[PDB]
């Protein structure tokens, strides 16, 4: 019944989670996207990224 324990999570994989997915693994931190590799392909054209080459 103490302070609900939550000990430092301020860097590495288990610091930040996918914006939507809540996944720790396969994040794009690039341009502060913070979206998972899979979730990003689903929301590619949504955010503006479309393939040309």
Query: Which residues does the annotation place in the binding site for Zn(2+)?
Result: 18, 21, 36, 39
Using rule CB under 7 A, residue 46 touches RNA: no
Select the binding partner of residue 12 from another protein, RNA, none (C-beta < 5 to 8 A, by kind): RNA
What is the distance between the alpha carbons of residues 34 and 8, in angstroms, rounded to a whole number? 20
Q: Are the CB atoms for 35 and 27 separated by under 8 Å?
A: yes
- Please state the length of the chain: 53
CB atoms within 10 A of CB 36: 22
Site for another protein in 10-49 (CB under 8 A): 17, 19-20, 22, 31-33, 35, 37-38, 41, 43-44, 46-49
Query: What is the closest distance, in whole angstroms, from the C-beta atom of residue 21 to RNA in the complex?
Result: 4
């Amino acid at each position: 019944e103490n302070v609900w324990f939550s000990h430092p999570r301020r860097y590495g994989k288990g610091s930040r989670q996918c914006r939507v997915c809540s996944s720790h693994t396969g994040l794009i931190r690039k341009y502060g996207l913070n979206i998972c590799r899979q979730c990003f392909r689903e929301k590619a054209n949504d955010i503006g990224f479309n393939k040309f080459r």
